């Protein structure tokens, strides 16, 4: 299913003026906007070609929202420092991720809103979009403030309305790229590590979206405990790369098979070292 | 389009 996400990072910096606020937006695995408060006149900027179609009023509307967030996160950072009895000399970070998952239809399938403090879960909106899960008692002070302000109700109206409507508009405006799955270009390489053991590397390249399954099989048995899997990485052209490796004793190269699962593939692939 | 209501933590 298609999704839209906004990622916020608010960081205090005791000896560099006031807190820095950064926002990035994504439609699936494609980034389309950015904002960074670290400028004299900060402005929202396009990051995908299909969003340049939006007029000046769209950019001003976004800028106004992210300027509100800069101010709001400055106070939240100060408040969280008080909950944890932290010194004003230390630098802290609040992160937030929110957004919608679209169904096969144009319906909200799942809504999200999660916050973190110093890299750990802080407060998250539950699946019902009407209640919260707080990580500790500091987060329960935030929860009490958010229940009194009815933040869960505001989010539910956003997630069920504007979030899915704007995601659908973006998917239509960028359909040639956003609604096209690029299947991986696959191949298996061979690398001797010693005289009687060689590594077999299964490659998946130029694929979009990032979601992929790469598995090695010794005669058809999941070699999951012995497989080296690298984290999916961006190619830099909006496509992704990944590889799965196995240390194989010299002679049993034809014994091992690589299995590739991706939405761009009509049927899952089965590969082996050739020749 | 981002959410335009923000509440201090």
């Amino acid at each position, epitope marked *: 299913s298609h999704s839209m996400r906004y990622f916020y990072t608010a960081m205090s910096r005791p000896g560099r003026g006031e807190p820095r606020f950064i926002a990035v937006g994504y439609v699936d695995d494609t980034q389309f906007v950015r904002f960074d408060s670290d400028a004299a006149s900060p402005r929202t900027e396009p990051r995908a070609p299909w969003i340049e179609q939006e007029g000046p009023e769209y950019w001003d509307r976004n800028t106004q929202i992210f300027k509100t967030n800069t*101010q709001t996160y400055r106070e939240s950072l100060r408040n969280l420092r008080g909950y944890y009895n932290q010194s004003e000399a230390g630098s802290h970070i609040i992160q937030r991720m929110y957004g919608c998952d679209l169904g096969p239809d144009g319906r909200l399938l799942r809504g999200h809103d999660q916050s973190a403090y110093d890299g750990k879960d802080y407060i998250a909106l539950n699946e019902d979009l009407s209640s919260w899960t707080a990580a500790d008692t500091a987060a329960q002070i935030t929860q009490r403030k958010w229940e009194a*302000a*009815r933040v869960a109700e505001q989010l539910r*109206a956003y997630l069920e*309305g504007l979030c899915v409507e704007w995601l659908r508009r973006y998917l239509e405006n960028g359909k040639e790229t956003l609604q096209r799955a690029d299947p991986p270009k696959t191949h298996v390489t061979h690398h001797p590590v010693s005289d009687h053991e060689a590594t077999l590397r299964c490659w998946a390249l130029g694929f979009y979206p990032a979601e992929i399954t790469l598995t090695w099989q010794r005669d058809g048995e999941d070699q999951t405990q012995d497989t080296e899997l690298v984290e999916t990485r961006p190619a830099g052209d909006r496509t992704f790369q990944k590889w799965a490796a196995v240390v194989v004793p010299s002679g049993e190269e034809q014994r091992y098979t690589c299995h590739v699962q991706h939405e761009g593939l009509p049927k899952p692939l089965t590969l082996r070292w050739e020749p | 389009l981002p959410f335009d*209501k*923000a509440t*201090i933590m």
Partner: T-cell receptor
Amino acid sequence: AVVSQHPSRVICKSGTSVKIECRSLDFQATTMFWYRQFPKQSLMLMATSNEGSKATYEQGVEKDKFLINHASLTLSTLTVTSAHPEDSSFYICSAGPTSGRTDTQYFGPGTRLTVLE
Amino acid sequence: SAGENVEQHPSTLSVQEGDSAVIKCTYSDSASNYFPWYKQELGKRPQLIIDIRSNVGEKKDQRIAVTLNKTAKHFSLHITETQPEDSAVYFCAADGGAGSYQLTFGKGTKLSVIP
């Protein structure tokens, strides 16, 4: 999530300056709204008080007459300078815990200002 | 706010005790997703009585209810089995429009519940 005002009633001679406070009693507010009500009971927005920024005045509001100061995250003041009998009215503020596109607003009790020659 | 205008119908309403009272509001902007209703008794502050958001068609709280038609851009307040204590000025609002953030209020409905 109450909002309060002080004073609640003012009787003053013409030419005096009258300062009115708007306080969020149990929440922090980045924005407060100042209204004026006459016998024709509609709520006339005068100005929006902004924390760390100058006030946003509505069309037809004598700026130099009504000074708005966002003092902190809980207090906003309205000052009616050199008050004259025509300035007599019911001044009421509102504030809410949500910033950005306005959400639930809680009104103060109002201030009845009576200016006499 | 620049693109939002809220209109309250009727401006004055007299109802007989025990009868129902309906106040309808219309709005113009698509960025409106929050719709509150305030009750103001003479010389007192407007008090929030009920509100509704764009993802809900109807909300009910005992004798009071609010309904929303987001396609036609109108919302209504329904008071059932009216009591003389319901006599007040009622205001509706919307949060839409561009520019400076604010609630856009209707000009009010003076409701008179005849005992």
